[PDB]
Design a protein around this ligand. Structure first.
Ligand code: NA
Ligand code: NA
Lengths: 330, 330
């Protein structure tokens, strides 16, 4: 089954233009100077002005299409892979298709939803479409506006979240090119659903029904219990991932590219690997939910200079709870 | 590329136990006797008591797993493919995994979202995973509770919607078995997004923001404009679908199995094909959104007696606007 031919042909990003410095948030909301950097690992973030999520996604997508040496008309499948919805109906796929000027194109546009790990799962889905020769040039878009959830009474909230979009065009590699996936794995532990969830926003606690509570529209998080899921199941997850590519180990990989919704994953990695192995975006873009991993992938290539033939590792933990990992040659 | 080996190994359904007769709705809400059957094509529907969407999905899934001759522990991927969310976070995949008692299993559980055509797109995604030998035994679950959207001031609304879940287990066929996909196609016309949409429920019109209006949480529908998308693009859609399987035509197919959110698609088909070719569920289960197509697939096999080696056609139009079609040997 592995290795799977797979080429990240183009990458794109959109972030809002206005930088919100942690130092200015601290001055405005009476936090100690340096609090955000120490507690959150966040020095800056970007918040939207009037952008919609589809607008940001389309901007990132256009950059990725240019980067791939393609025109918009060459894309034959669009996958929206964001951490949060723009609206209830339709899904984000058709909305970004419309925003791209492709609304009359017929190009299928769908959503893959694995919460904040949607981008990862979309890559995996796309890899299978490509190798089955179903589609040739697949656009994956992850765009999130988390600044809508900002509560300026709560420092743990309002200093954490940022807005961003990133996108990839994926294709099969050309003859001679080594681009491939060596290993890919997704596991889900739904017993952890209650430790990171928003119980409102759907049928179970519909606003017009009898099951509503005041706390329905807020993220319920139990960090201690989430970590326990990691303690119990991550070692075997990692073991099983690397068994897929026994010829390749972490020493053969230039960059670790994590979903990074908080500094914890980065701190874990920093105790393990040299700093130059780790791709960091939370410092300048904060927690951008579903866009975090693809933002880090963009960073690895467009700032970190990841070269064709070098290898990377995508990794993440997300609400669900799910774990993902992928070892690839760029 | 086609034909693609593909076996619908098991099918399952859950519907609420209490039948709501159109005749009783008409008596209670002062509608003419026979109004629902004439205007909607709906004689009965089922509405939940205390069920959650995950509960119904899990019930349908268990039936499908039994039908496939499997145990729950044999499933290696779960795809939630519903028309509406149970809650905001996490997605429905982990929630149905938990409901099935598989919360500690590690089995990846994700969501594919193409609005009311999610089940179709999940089948397509699953077919590619199966043929790439990534997973062997894939559960697809579509569960929707639309009765939460009921407005008893509006006959066009409250007589239309029903609750239901259906599920499929899909695998590769055994040696000698003819089960396959002859043709599959998805097209999206995002210019039609505004003609069937709910603008609230996400970041664009977040309740705490400045873009809210009173009508945000209601389905905006422009039926005339939706039909125009059909007039312009359906003929070429159908042409392109059947060109994938030039050896197979509609005469070679026993059943047409449509997504059926209203009587219109059924009326179109009834003018074209003998009644015994069409699989109808709206009459007894009403508009069950994302569950409509898989409910009809269940009906085709478990009531219509579709035999292995006979052929069917899945067809649908959904919010987006998207069109789907698949020609398969059962
Ligand atoms: Na850009
Ligand atoms: Na059942």
């Amino acid at each position: 089954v592995f290795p799977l031919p797979f080429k990240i042909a183009g990458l794109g990003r959109y972030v809002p233009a206005d930088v919100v410095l942690s130092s200015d948030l601290e001055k405005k909301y009476d936090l100690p100077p340096g609090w955000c950097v120490e507690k959150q690992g966040i020095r800056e973030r970007r918040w939207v002005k009037d952008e919609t999520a589809s607008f940001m996604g389309a901007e990132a997508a256009k950059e990725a299409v240019r980067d791939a040496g393609l025109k918009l008309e060459d894309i034959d499948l669009i996958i929206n892979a964001s951490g949060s919805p723009e609206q209830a109906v339709p899904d984000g796929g058709p909305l970004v298709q419309r925003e791209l000027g492709l609304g009359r194109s017929g190009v299928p546009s769908i959503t893959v939803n694995a919460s904040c790990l949607s981008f990862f799962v979309a890559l995996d889905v796309a890899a299978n479409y490509l190798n089955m020769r179903r589609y040739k040039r697949i656009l994956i878009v992850s765009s999130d506006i988390s600044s809508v959830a900002l509560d300026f009474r709560k420092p743990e909230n309002f200093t954490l979240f940022g807005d961003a979009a990133a996108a990839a065009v994926v294709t099969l590699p050309e003859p001679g090119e080594k681009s491939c996936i060596h290993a890919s794995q997704v596991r889900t532990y739904g017993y952890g659903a209650e430790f990171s969830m928003v119980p409102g926003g759907g049928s179970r606690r519909h606003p017009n029904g009898k099951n509503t509570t005041p706390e329905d529209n807020y993220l319920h998080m139990n960090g201690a219990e989430l970590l326990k899921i990691g303690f119990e199941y991550l070692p075997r997850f990692n073991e099983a991932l690397w068994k897929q590519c026994p010829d390749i180990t972490i020493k053969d990989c230039r960059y670790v590219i994590p979903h990074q919704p908080s500094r914890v994953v980065l701190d874990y990695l920093s105790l393990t690997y040299p700093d130059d192995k780790l791709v960091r975006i939370i410092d300048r873009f904060a927690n951008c939910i579903g866009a975090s991993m693809p933002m880090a992938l963009y960073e690895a290539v467009k700032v970190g200079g990841l070269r064709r033939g070098e290898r990377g590792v995508l990794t993440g933990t997300g609400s669900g709870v799910s774990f993902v990992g992928m070892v690839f040659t760029y």
